[PDB]
Amino acid sequence: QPVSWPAFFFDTHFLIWLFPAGVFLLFLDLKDEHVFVIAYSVLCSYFAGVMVRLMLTLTPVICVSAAVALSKIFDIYLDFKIKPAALLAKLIVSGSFIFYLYLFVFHSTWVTRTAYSSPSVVLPKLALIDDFREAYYWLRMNSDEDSKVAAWWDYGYQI
Amino acid sequence: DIWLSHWASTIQFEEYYELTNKAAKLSKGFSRLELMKQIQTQNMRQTHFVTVLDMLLPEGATDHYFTDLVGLVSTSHAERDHFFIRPRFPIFGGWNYNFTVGWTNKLSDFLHVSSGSDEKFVASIPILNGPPDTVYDNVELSVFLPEGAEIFDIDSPVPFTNVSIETQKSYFDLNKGHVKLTFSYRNLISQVANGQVLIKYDYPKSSFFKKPLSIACYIFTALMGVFVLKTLNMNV
Amino acid sequence: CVLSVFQTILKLVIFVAIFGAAISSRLFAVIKFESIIHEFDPWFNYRATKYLVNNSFYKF
Amino acid sequence: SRIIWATLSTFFIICMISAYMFNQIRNTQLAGYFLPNEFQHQFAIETQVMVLIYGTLAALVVVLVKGIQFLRSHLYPETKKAYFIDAILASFCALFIYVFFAALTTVFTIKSPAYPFPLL
Amino acid sequence: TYEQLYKEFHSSKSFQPFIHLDTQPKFAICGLIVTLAVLSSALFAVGSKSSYIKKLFFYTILSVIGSLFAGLTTVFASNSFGVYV
Amino acid sequence: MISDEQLNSLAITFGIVMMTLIVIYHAVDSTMSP
Ligand SMILES: CCCCC/C=C/C/C=C/CCCCCCCC(=O)O[C@H](COC(=O)CCCCCCCCCCCCCCC)COP(=O)([O-])OCC[N+](C)(C)C
Ligand SMILES: CCCCC/C=C\C/C=C\CCCCCCCC(=O)O[C@H](COC(=O)CCCCCCCCCCCCCCC)COP(=O)([O-])OCC[N+](C)(C)C
Ligand SMILES: *[C@@H]1O[C@H](CO)[C@@H](O[C@@H]2O[C@H](CO)[C@@H](O[C@@H]3O[C@H](CO)[C@@H](O)[C@H](O)[C@@H]3O)[C@H](O)[C@H]2NC(C)=O)[C@H](O)[C@H]1NC(C)=O
Ligand SMILES: *[C@@H]1O[C@H](CO)[C@@H](O[C@@H]2O[C@H](CO)[C@@H](O)[C@H](O)[C@H]2NC(C)=O)[C@H](O)[C@H]1NC(C)=O
């Protein structure tokens, strides 16, 4: 079940573009660990493109590579050691990327509060619907302890 | 279950009710449509099923909660020393419902200090606090006193079937658990079984301060072990 | 040296913030509704761990 | 060469994260460029735009980290105030990274109009 | 006796908490900082490369205070979070 | 207990403090170490 492109931005903000860049920078030094990193990156990129469940196993590498890239950038534009022109050029870039960091924090908090924090047993004009727990508890308290319940396979684990 | 705490100076009540309506059974099964129709027209008409219960708590209760065996229940409302609780389903004749209620009170109006010795406490704890017209076939009143108490005297206004003293560990109880005194009763009625169990005991300051000391001893042993294992040569 | 003790203090503080972040970012359905198990498979995981805890590791 | 492999791998990654296999598994229609108010479906051509976007963004950062010196060496080889050309080019790279991030958020808000952080 | 006790229980003295619960949060926070300060120094003491005797006589004396503060801080934080001790 | 808007503010504050400590650490390490 392939995944469309907006989901890659939905799940990682500001870190989707930095991931290819970091793979590249990690393909310029080419040490031994970097080969492992690159293989992980390519393989999981493909697998997540195909299946929408594998994005999980693709996040640890996205993160790693992103970090690497950003760190490299900082290593040049936060190393101050006067020529005020260079100071302005360092401030511009470092501030732009700290801004991006804060924006990433806000985007992440919003996404997790809006999309991945919804209960499953209770169903939320805008009232609470607790029919599943009600019916299951009735079954639990007013049925014989050795009764058999026949229902579709989707609810067997809650039943 | 009544838990007394001197450090926070609070008395926590928590009750677990196995309830059942023994009225006339429902003929022709249960029809949700008939129930909704009755609700639609029959306004404040006396019935023989349980829709809402009215628990009467002590004055100034706080932090109420109403829970079930499948999570909590959100249909509960606490006003003016009263707590209305609506079960998940209306208890008809021959149905069961096991649930839990809890709340907290100030320990100042349940524990008095003996004037004989500053370290001798007396407690009067109610026997029942529940629905206005209910019947109890079995009661187990457990009182949990702090880790260092020593029961000294006990009195119950109505006869009991068995009284026991033990210990039961709880949060941050390292040496030995809270002192747990359990009374058993058989046939109690809501409004008729009034009375206050009275429990005299001792709690010396040395037992008061033994809790932070126990926690600090645990932390100190952990630190000494970390030091030992950090100042040991295991190199080759 | 001086720096080698700073970078340590600071790092510790950082790793206390990281934790506080993650934890606080994941308790959004526990602090709004209640502490309960969410999806279908977790209910079986919970059944199995409860069985393990109640009886024995051999019986599990 | 390290550069050929690096470029090929990075291009393949950029093509893979731009939902390229979505147009292969599902048979989507080129255009009608972006399918509005649709978070899961997409025109094929959206894989050809996002790539560019991504292909630019990453590119700029690499220039920032690596080839800032090449640009001075080949654009203005005067070598009198190289430290100034460096600074100006770094500032422009940052500005363009911002512009393209803004473009990305604009297209994402097109695909999901209920997004609070559109960067512009 | 039940009546003798019931009459004993009506002694005008009533329970008065040692430290009011309303001001237990504050204390906790305060305690916390101390618990973090002194303790941390002790850990750094290890690795000083001084004599073993000095690093022990210092570690123990700094922990016999870090612990004593941390116990009280834990009690107060537990009480303030709703789990009473 | 604690409400939801408070836990949101707390999560955001934790994140901001973390990312600021990280930036300060990176600046210190990059400026004072070759
Ligand atoms: C390096 C780690 C340092 C600490 C960092 C983390 C801690 C901060 C946590 C924040 C909030 C936690 C509390 C949740 C709110 C209430 C939960 C609740 O209510 O659930 C409780 C579970 O209580 C717990 O076990 C929470 C423990 C309290 C935590 C306090 C923090 C101090 C931890 C330091 C540990 C040092 C160990 C020393 C070695 C001896 C269930 O109560 P119940 O159903 O029995 O009802 C009670 C009613 N009766 C009694 C009538 C039945
Ligand atoms: C490796 C380290 C990792 C550090 C980060 C880890 C975890 C933190 C991240 C997120 C925390 C989620 C917050 C959930 C709070 C829900 C409960 C609630 O809402 O409590 C609030 C109260 O709060 C507070 O004022 C607590 C203020 C105390 C400050 C914290 C003390 C320091 C504890 C940490 C260190 C402990 C050991 C120190 C020495 C070893 C509501 O209380 P209440 O009305 O429900 O009941 C209480 C009933 N009265 C009101 C009557 C009492
Ligand atoms: C909720 O509370 C009710 C009230 O006590 C519990 O009902 C009790 O359930 C047990 C087992 O489910 C019954 O034991 C049975 O006794 C019969 C003899 O009559 C025996 O033949 C069976 O093999 C079984 O041992 C018990 O009689 C019953 N009590 C009443 C008054 O009906 C119920 O179990 C509780 N449910 C939960 C989930 O806690
Ligand atoms: C009164 O005390 C307890 C009430 O539960 C019972 O005696 C104990 O019962 C437990 C079972 O819960 C047994 O494991 C113990 O061996 C029993 N004896 C003791 C000394 O604990 C019983 O109902 C009563 N005991 C009497 C009258 O001796």
XYZ file of C-alpha atoms in Angstrom, chain F residues 7-34:
28
model
C 0.320 19.806 29.169
C 0.671 21.286 25.689
C 2.460 24.327 27.097
C 4.678 22.006 29.152
C 5.584 19.835 26.152
C 6.410 22.915 24.078
C 8.523 24.389 26.880
C 10.466 21.146 27.315
C 11.128 21.016 23.576
C 12.265 24.638 23.389
C 14.585 24.288 26.389
C 16.063 21.107 24.917
C 16.721 22.639 21.500
C 18.225 25.762 23.061
C 20.570 23.824 25.326
C 21.587 21.755 22.289
C 22.328 24.882 20.246
C 24.346 26.430 23.085
C 26.340 23.216 23.520
C 27.076 23.033 19.795
C 28.206 26.669 19.680
C 30.481 26.233 22.705
C 31.998 23.020 21.345
C 32.537 24.383 17.829
C 34.100 27.670 18.947
C 36.426 26.265 21.657
C 37.618 23.081 19.934
C 39.511 22.607 16.611
